[PDB]
Write a protein that binds this ligand. Structure first.
Ligand SMILES: *[C@@H]1O[C@H](CO)[C@@H](O)[C@H](O)[C@H]1NC(C)=O
Ligand SMILES: *[C@@H]1O[C@H](CO)[C@@H](O)[C@H](O)[C@H]1NC(C)=O
Ligand SMILES: *[C@@H]1O[C@H](CO)[C@@H](O)[C@H](O)[C@H]1NC(C)=O
Ligand SMILES: *[C@@H]1O[C@H](CO)[C@@H](O)[C@H](O)[C@H]1NC(C)=O
Ligand SMILES: *[C@@H]1O[C@H](CO)[C@@H](O)[C@H](O)[C@H]1NC(C)=O
Ligand SMILES: *[C@@H]1O[C@H](CO)[C@@H](O)[C@H](O)[C@H]1NC(C)=O
Ligand SMILES: *[C@@H]1O[C@H](CO)[C@@H](O)[C@H](O)[C@H]1NC(C)=O
Ligand SMILES: *[C@@H]1O[C@H](CO)[C@@H](O)[C@H](O)[C@H]1NC(C)=O
Ligand SMILES: *[C@@H]1O[C@H](CO)[C@@H](O)[C@H](O)[C@H]1NC(C)=O
Ligand SMILES: *[C@@H]1O[C@H](CO)[C@@H](O)[C@H](O)[C@H]1NC(C)=O
Ligand SMILES: [Ca+2]
Ligand SMILES: [Ca+2]
Ligand SMILES: [Ca+2]
Ligand SMILES: [Ca+2]
Ligand SMILES: [Ca+2]
Lengths: 471, 446, 474, 482
């Protein structure tokens, strides 16, 4: 029935740890990190130009130059000194930066029958084939190459390539007329020609009423075929400040959490002394060591974060009018968030090693151990046909549908079909003959294996009890 | 009693109105046009001049936007501020400041938000403060706060001329500036084709980042007669309200002969409450109509003055909420009266072992939903709108279980994690139901 | 085993009858009736004017006149090619160059009285007019405006030989104030200008109809269009439409002349099935009414009789319409009555065919193929009735509660029947919860969560009840 | 356990064959084939004109001329940079600055005859001509208009060297009235103006095709575009398109001199599988046609031989086309035929690879009885056949009822098979209830409710039936032993 497990002490000293780990993850999260993202997205991605071109609807180089000299400068510069306050409250930090990565002039040698019409060839992007020589007037910082170490920066796994960190850049000047002059001079000479492979626009803003950084990066990729593909990443960073009451409380509970993880690691290595073998038998110990690992890396990132933020702010006010790299911080703070949520999930479900509820959390393992060697041979049979269908759907559709454009996309598309999220008209317009067949036969296969697994476990139970009763 | 319960249910299932929907819809459609395109307080004036004045004074003298809806009195524009505490950060990045959350404005300024002169009082200006008691008492519950009932108040109405006069006088003098929190536009309307009195509030409130959120709040009340709703409705209601008094007398003579144990039986707590609620409903209905009449007594004395019908609408909302409870109690009582006079036990006592399955299965549920809600809120709560908070996430995960919400954006955002979380959910539920099958088939065999 | 019931002499006869009615009902449906409706509705319901007012987004009376002037005469009257060279066929308008416009369009209006209700006692010297909601007894029947023409005097439903109409609020009568539009487009523009200057649409107006018809001869089909705009007593406007593609003339080519043989054999089959069903009741006097497969035979016979009657009714009516169209043009021809009843005839034919298939299911038998659940609910038929009543009383309580809490702000809850169907749809996984969460911030989530838990509870109970039955005894 | 059968060597050679065909299939699919189609299809279908007419919103014969003279010539002919600086390579259109326009675009048209109808006598005095719906028998072959050019006279299918085409209403022929658009944008504007002035789209027109093709050399790919507009007998237009990205030129690279080494292996593996599937016939003279693995082992061999045969034809025809393009430019090169058949070849290859993947259970099969089910195929031989022909009767009755009630209003019920798939999708929780409720707000709800109740009923019936049957037989098989 319902009864505390294995002692009364560990349960209370764990329901203390659970309560303490829930407040450390709600002292990092703000409730105005969704309004902020929503508003900055509405400002920079939806605002149309004359000719009505938003960033989300850029489809050529002309559209890029229309968005850049129109709504970008209009959205980055407000007034009512020598500073910008977007919407009067969000201060712009430093200078926005345009960056471009190109590809070499002779990379993908042309066929035999076309080399009298087409003379030079530009491959797809790859760090091997890349252009590093000056072009245009060969004069400024936007017409010469600076490697990834000079421009201290990191790769970006955006779309199709995972672009590098160097390239040809331009830091926009202070006022609006100066930036307009710079961009017009950048356009009059062909800054974007057949060699251009990607363009980034990076900047960041800081709001002080709520305490937040909004870090914006807009990417536009120019494939080897023409046109553009735009993408964006908008992230938010906290910057906690240590004066208030609540913040002193949070510092205290930080110390408590560190003490707790020390206690738990010493207890695990203390009971490893007892019964060395069989210690790998229980899954709960695996959960404990997983939580320990995640907690120590959590505190690691928590100190590194403060290091880098003080460094950034120092460089930022010591010499403004330059570019302050907030992108590294945003990326890794997001990864830290994604990790802390998982750690919280595990800490929450680790209470079934404790106060127990009967007729479910007693025989799920009793049935799982019985329902094995008949389901491992049922998963090797399901995934063969699952991946066969994945390849069939990648090869039938996938030049027309985006959800089938690659292999992993097909995998998750089939998963979503199982969950009940499909767009049947897309599959049906792609192929009017094999679209329906693919759909129908896939659904039937899934339901078939489901009910066969069900019947297998039912007959297993039957036989088991029949041999256990009348034996 | 059969007649008593059937009369009660037909008196709760009746009293519906098909016009309160269409009135609200017409008004909302007309006044909410281009309202959400207001980001800053610099835009409020083109919107006011373009799609607020043509609708408040609609080409029939007295009515809003097509005839059909009379305008009752002046139109109020109210605003609550934060004190102008000169910030101008500039060189203020080291040791960044903390703006206070204990600040409201309660002082009397004088034209241009400057110090006032040696007549320290509380005059009726657009710059002096107005108490909530002095004003129509009505704390408004906006979207990200619960603003007060006071503030800085102007009234511009009953023509199109005076409206534009004061709308160009407010802008020229900078009445609305950066120290402005929520703003409210309030008016009242009466429709005599389908007797209905509606109150409209338009709320423009300030978020953190300098930008505004927009909302509308409409509240309607039908002042018919409470008695001239026609024949065949007064007779059923009068016999029902006589039987309510009969049952009140029954329970009274039951309590006097008991002096105690009256609260120990379910058949007594379920009828006395019904009697009390049925009385209070008609009491509050008569009270609401009286309040409306005596507030119209004020309008007939001097129009061109603002009037708030908030008390009547609030007691009417009380009347409305006291009907869900009447319905709930009636359902429970009918179900019991039926399970008694027909042996219709619902469960074959498989849903209980004397106390445990009750609280030995509503803890699994709470732990699992808290786990998944907290994780989904921390992972996706910064972009997706259905996971903004903990309770939003609770409702959204319950919807996922039912099927009304789909995993299309949580897979489009975090495929690698969102896929494994759904997989964990499915495996857990499948194991649960397989256990429910095997234990069942093993019980009836041993 | 699927042994055959009553002798093969019966099964083969019924198979012949079944394929006969299938040929009948599928020879009279055309492959190009969806595209006809598509293009016509897209031309009249989606084309916007300058200022971008299409019929679907009419929201005032000024919007109505905007649509009626610009993108209603531009679509109705076609007299040039796209290179502004005139078509040859004169005095007629061929929409899309193929669809002949029959007769003359008609505008109709239903008004209400200036004093249909009494104003409240308080607002009796401030409000001087009361316009009730639409009802046939509160209906203005006096002239207004210039009080002279046909658009300013009242015409009864028997003068305007016409019928009802079930809109989105009520059912409207068949008379009122009307105007027929003339031949050319400029004459129609001037007529509409005259209707708008002298104020035809005031607050007494409750509903406006625009009726016209079109015939395509390439395919052999009619399209009858009726555009309706409703002006509720609460303010606002609600547009709707009925666009019916029908086949009224149905003997043109050889494929149609083949169908007359199928119709004759259909009549003789009905004669056979009515003489046969009486020799089945001449024997079993009132034991005949025990078999359920006998109510279905009576229903099929009745429906076939009704169809045979409507056949000759439609023939006579279309002859009359064509005659009056040819002899006196420039007049409105009431094609909407015949179109409505032809559509209902098609619906009835569909239902009759659906029942013919079930009768075939009756002729052959299977020993026990889906009698497994019927057996269990014939054995355990007491507790399931308790669960049925306990589910239904709570279901209706929840529907009424959802009507109370929401239903002024959300449409899906604005009516008891809408609440019933919205809950039924929640059960299937189709619901926009953000609406009811905007409507009520506290009781929205409560309503939703408790309803879902109640549904899950009832299903769990039913499953534990029926699977605990297949194991009772051994 | 994993009971590996059939002389494991056979498994180790079939794995080699499988790896070889996966190397041969994925080595000819580009990853940039989707982003080619995406941009070439959003350039020509989503580009509005001054009046706002895209190709997807053509709804008249006047919108066709609004689009054909605006956003079509604008997108076809690229001659300057975005800063009004001329491109270097001249007398050649480089779409998006990378994609070379091959040959000349072609406009083709098919019209219908004048007296292809009867005008039933009630209207015989108002309506004089009747044009039928499209069908090859009822087709105009006379000249019209000025009656002299190539756009006003008829050319048969053998003369144009054309082929059929499956549209949304019917399947059109290959001949018709055509006009090639050579040269600059100014030379094409005049030709299109000439076609508009003297009416080229009149009451007889039934379909219009626009064909062209571009080639990209950065990634060795072709995009063939065919934009179709169908003018039904009712009036209006229906626009559709086929945009095909294909790799017709195989080897230009270093990887491709290796994949040929793969394919010659393929052509001998086939010879190893056809030389052994005849030995079994020699040993099992007619018992060879017993299992179905010997039936899949025939389909896969056949599909492989067909692929080997198509390779040669593709090579020869691409050589012919590339020669014609070079020897006489300013004329239309028919790339649509090859693009269609290359796409069909890709489809057949994908199906063959799927069958080769699922043919792995013939070699390495586990031991859950047969598939942990045949236990239910004991009393299924008389029960499942009775359960299917009783569910499909009611299913198709509902399908017909839904096609006859809705189907002039809702599109998902336009045809019979559309209702079939629509109901199949209703079972999976994917429905649009408002369309059904608007089409008929009395029989719509009835249809919906009764249908979902019917499917829920048969689901519950099947479930409890199978559990009850397996219980009964396990019980009696326990009882029989004691
Ligand atoms: C490629 O670009 C370079 C620029 O560094 C130029 O010098 C060279 O001539 C170009 N090659 C060709 C074949 O145009
Ligand atoms: C740019 O070119 C100018 C001459 O036009 C030269 O003096 C200068 O050194 C170059 N580099 C710069 C400005 O960084
Ligand atoms: C207000 O709107 C009217 C009509 O839109 C216009 O005539 C008037 O100039 C506007 N007022 C201002 C201050 O723009
Ligand atoms: C405007 O309203 C004021 C009072 O609200 C009144 O004194 C004045 O006469 C009105 N003007 C007109 C033109 O009606
Ligand atoms: C339309 O046709 C008329 C006469 O055929 C001509 O005068 C006019 O220029 C044409 N074009 C228009 C009105 O745009
Ligand atoms: C209402 O309409 C009637 C119609 O004849 C008219 O006589 C009357 O003057 C109107 N106004 C009032 C206030 O009754
Ligand atoms: C109304 O009809 C009468 C009857 O002939 C006529 O005298 C009068 O001129 C008409 N008025 C208008 C505006 O047409
Ligand atoms: C476009 O290019 C032409 C070609 O010489 C030029 O005359 C014109 O000024 C350009 N227009 C621009 C750049 O706006
Ligand atoms: C009908 O078609 C014939 C066949 O060419 C043609 O000669 C005749 O002129 C056409 N009639 C009309 C009215 O276009
Ligand atoms: C036009 O027609 C005439 C005779 O019908 C023919 O001789 C000529 O070649 C045609 N083409 C022209 C004039 O371009
Ligand atoms: Ca923290
Ligand atoms: Ca441990
Ligand atoms: Ca789902
Ligand atoms: Ca009978
Ligand atoms: Ca074989």
């Amino acid at each position: 029935e319902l009864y505390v497990k294995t002692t009364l002490r560990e349960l209370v000293v764990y329901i203390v740890f659970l309560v303490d780990i829930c407040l450390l993850t709600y002292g990092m999260t703000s409730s105005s990190a969704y309004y902020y993202t929503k508003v900055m997205s509405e400002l920079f991605l939806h605002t149309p130009s004359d000719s009505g071109v938003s960033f989300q609807t850029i489809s050529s180089m002309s559209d890029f130059w229309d968005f850049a000299q129109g709504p970008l400068l209009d959205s980055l510069y407000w007034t009512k000194g020598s500073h910008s306050f977007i919407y009067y409250e969000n201060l712009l930090l430093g200078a926005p930066r345009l960056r471009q990565l190109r590809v070499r002039n002779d990379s993908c040698v042309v066929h035999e029958d076309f080399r009298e019409d087409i003379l030079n060839c530009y491959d797809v992007y790859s760090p091997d084939k890349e252009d590093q020589l000056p072009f245009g007037p060969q004069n400024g910082t936007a017409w010469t190459y600076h490697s990834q170490n000079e421009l201290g920066g990191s790769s970006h796994w955006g779309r199709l390539t995972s672009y590098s960190g160097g390239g040809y850049y331009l830091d926009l000047p202070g006022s609006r007329q100066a930036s307009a002059e710079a961009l017009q001079g950048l356009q009059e000479g062909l800054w974007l020609d057949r060699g251009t492979r990607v363009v980034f626009i990076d900047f960041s803003v800081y709001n002080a009423n709520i305490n937040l950084f909004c870090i914006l990066r807009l990417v536009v990729e120019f494939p080897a075929t023409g046109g553009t593909i735009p993408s964006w990443q908008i992230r938010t960073v906290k910057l906690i400040r240590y004066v208030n009451n609540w913040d002193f409380f949070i510092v205290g509970c930080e110390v408590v959490f560190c003490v707790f993880i020390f206690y738990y690691v010493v207890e695990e290595i203390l009971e490893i002394h007892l019964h060395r073998l069989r210690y790998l038998s229980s899954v709960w110990n695996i959960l404990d060591l997983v939580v320990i690992l995640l907690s120590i890396v959590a505190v690691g990132f928590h100190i590194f974060r403060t290091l880098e933020v003080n460094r950034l702010m120092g460089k930022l006010l010591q010499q403004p009018d330059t570019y302050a790299d907030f992108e590294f911080l945003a990326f890794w703070q997001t990864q830290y968030n994604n990790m802390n949520a998982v750690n919280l999930f595990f800490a929450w479900i680790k209470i079934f090693k404790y106060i127990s509820f009967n007729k479910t959390m007693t025989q799920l393992s009793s049935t799982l151990a019985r329902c094995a060697k008949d389901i491992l041979g049922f998963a090797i049979m399901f995934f063969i046909v699952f991946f066969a269908y994945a390849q069939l759907g990648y090869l039938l559709f996938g030049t027309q549908v985006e959800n089938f454009s690659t292999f992993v996309k097909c995998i998750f598309t089939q998963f979503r079909i199982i969950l009940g999220d499909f767009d049947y008209n897309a599959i049906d317009n792609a192929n009017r003959i094999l679209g329906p067949v693919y759909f129908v036969t896939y659904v039937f296969f899934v339901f078939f294996v489901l009910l066969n697994m069900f019947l297998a476990i039912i007959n297993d139970t039957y036989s088991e009890v029949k041999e256990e009763l009348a034996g | 009693q059969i007649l008593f319960l059937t009369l009660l249910m037909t008196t709760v299932y009746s009293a519906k109105d098909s016009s309160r929907f269409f009135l609200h819809r017409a008004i909302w459609k007309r006044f909410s046009h281009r309202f959400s395109e207001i980001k800053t307080v610099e835009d409020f004036y083109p919107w006011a001049n373009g799609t607020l004045l043509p609708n408040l004074y609609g080409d029939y003298r007295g009515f809003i936007t097509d005839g059909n809806s009379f305008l009752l009195g002046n139109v109020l524009i109210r605003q609550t501020r934060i004190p102008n505490d000169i910030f101008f950060p500039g060189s203020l990045h080291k040791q960044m400041k903390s703006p206070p959350q204990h600040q409201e404005d309660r002082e009397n300024y004088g034209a241009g938000w400057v110090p006032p002169d040696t007549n320290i009082t509380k005059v009726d200006s657009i710059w002096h403060y107005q108490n909530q008691e002095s004003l129509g008492g009505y704390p408004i519950q906006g979207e990200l706060a619960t603003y007060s009932g006071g503030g800085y108040v102007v009234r511009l109405g009953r023509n199109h001329s005076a409206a534009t006069r004061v709308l160009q006088h407010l802008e020229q003098r900078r009445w609305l500036d950066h120290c402005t929190k929520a703003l409210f536009v309030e008016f009242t309307v009466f429709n005599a084709n389908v007797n209905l009195l509606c109150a409209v509030t338009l709320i423009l409130e300030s978020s953190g980042v300098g930008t505004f959120l927009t909302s509308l709040q409409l509240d309607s009340l039908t002042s018919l007669q409470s008695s001239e709703r026609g024949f065949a409705w007064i007779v059923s209601q009068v016999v029902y309200y006589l039987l309510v008094c009969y049952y009140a007398f029954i329970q009274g003579c039951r309590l006097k002969r008991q002096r105690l144990a009256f609260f120990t039986r379910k058949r007594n707590l379920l009828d006395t409450s019904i009697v009390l609620i049925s009385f209070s409903i008609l009491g509050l209905s008569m009270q609401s109509l009286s309040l409306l009449h005596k507030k119209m007594q004020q309008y007939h004395c001097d129009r061109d003055r603002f009037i708030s019908f908030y008390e009547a609408l609030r007691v009417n909302s009380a009347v409305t909420h006291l009907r869900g409870f009447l319905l709930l109690f009636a359902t429970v009582r009918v179900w019991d009266l039926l399970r008694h006079h027909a042996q219709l036990q619902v469960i074959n006592k498989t849903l209980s072992k004397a106390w445990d399955e009750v609280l030995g299965f509503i803890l699994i549920i709470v732990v699992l939903l808290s786990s998944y809600a907290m994780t989904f809120n921390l992972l996706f709560g910064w972009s997706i709108s259905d996971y903004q908070s903990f309770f939003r996430s609770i409702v959204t995960v319950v919807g996922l279980l039912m099927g009304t919400s789909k995993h299309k954006e949580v897979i489009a955002l975090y495929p690698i994690l969102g896929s494994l979380l759904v997989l964990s959910s499915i495996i857990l539920m499948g194991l649960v139901i397989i256990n429910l099958f095997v234990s069942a088939i093993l019980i009836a065999f041993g």
